[PDB]
Amino acid sequence: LSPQLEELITKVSKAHQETFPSLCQLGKYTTNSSADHRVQLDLGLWDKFSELATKCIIKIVEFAKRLPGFTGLSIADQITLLKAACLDILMLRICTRYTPEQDTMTFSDGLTLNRTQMHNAGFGPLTDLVFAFAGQLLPLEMDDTETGLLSAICLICGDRMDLEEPEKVDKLQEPLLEALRLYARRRRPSQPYMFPRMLMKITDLRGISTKGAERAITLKMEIPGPMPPLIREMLEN
């Protein structure tokens, strides 16, 4: 029924709004650390960065739990979905926080890093691809509810590997897909290609994430210690 789809759009939208501060509500602020030029790794910047990443992973687990039916999946499956889509979601998130004129990305506490800093923070040689994905996202002009539904679709995916009940996850995802097309089309009738464009972003995102995981391998050798436990949880996927 439509009321249910509408209900689903509102829930997800709020789940997302409540776990991911919009950019325009963020009290932006800066740092003067290695803004100068690129280097292998600025350890102060990496600490702040990984600390923010850890918190966003928890926020993501929170978001997932507010998605109808997630909590009804086996705990093994829930964990399986989180490990598999978490990096993808992190990517879509800072990328949706891109500011083209300043060429910066803003983290959840308002920390705004310029391209050199994101590099020094840890993205290293993957920075420009990240910024390139961010840029190629702007044309879509997705709103909060669309980014939330899309992240929900990235997460609830029955094609994951250790799924115990992949069929249950597919059925959970189904309404999310309906929700996104209905909403995307309603908000913009004149742009029929938005739904499929957004769906194709999922595949790109997954592409930048595998690269990001590979970036983590190298990163591990640059840091004078182990990466935060929640981040490692995510990387062991």
Ligand X SMILES: CC1=C(/C=C/C(C)=C\C=C\C(C)=C\C(=O)O)C(C)(C)CCC1
Taking the complex as a whole, how short is the minimal distance between the CB of residue 21 and ligand X, in angstroms? 8
Does 231 contact ligand X by CB under 6 A?
yes
Binding pattern to ligand X, positions 73-92, x when CB under 6 A? -----------------xx-
Taking the complex as a whole, how short is the minimal distance between the CB of residue 70 and ligand X, in angstroms? 21
Q: Which is nearer to ligand X, 84 or 231 (CB)?
A: 231
Closest by CA to 159, choosing from 116, 192, 206, 110, is 206
Sign of CA dihedral 195, 201, 206, 209: negative
**Which residues, listed in sequence order, are joined to residue 104 by a DSSP beta bridge?**
99, 114
For residue 113, the 8-state DSSP code is: E
Closest by CA to 222, choosing from 101, 45, 57, is 45
Does 94 contact ligand X by CB under 6 A?
yes
Site residues for ligand X, window 118-147 (CB under 6 A)? 122-123
Closest by CA to 118, choosing from 213, 30, 197, is 30
Task: Give strand ranges (E) for 38-121.
Answer: 98-99, 104-106, 112-114
Tell me the residue nearest to ligand X as measured from the CB: 212
Q: Which is nearer to ligand X, 13 or 108 (CB)?
A: 108
Q: Which is nearer to ligand X, 8 or 87 (CB)?
A: 87
Contact yes or no for 121/46 (Cβ under 8 A): yes
Taking the complex as a whole, how short is the minimal distance between the CB of residue 78 and ligand X, in angstroms? 20
Q: Which is nearer to ligand X, 87 or 152 (CB)?
A: 87
Site residues for ligand X, window 206-225 (CB under 6 A)? 212, 215-216, 219
Residue position matching structure tokens 């539904």: 149
- Site for ligand X (CB under 6 A): which residue of 19, 78, 80, 108? 108
Angle between helices 43-65 and 2-19 (to 10 degrees): 150
Taking the complex as a whole, how short is the minimal distance between the CB of residue 220 and ligand X, in angstroms? 9
Alpha-carbon distance 217 to 226, whole Å?
A: 11
Q: Count residues binding ligand X (CB under 6 A).
A: 16
Q: Which is nearer to ligand X, 79 or 216 (CB)?
A: 216
Helical H segments across 123-193, by residue range: 127-135, 144-155, 166-187
**Which residues, listed in sequence order, are joined to residue 29 by a DSSP beta bridge?**
111
Does 156 contact ligand X by CB under 6 A?
no
- Site for ligand X (CB under 6 A): which residue of 8, 12, 53, 73? 53
Interacting residues toward ligand X by CB under 6 A: 52-53, 56, 90-91, 93-94, 107-108, 122-123, 212, 215-216, 219, 231
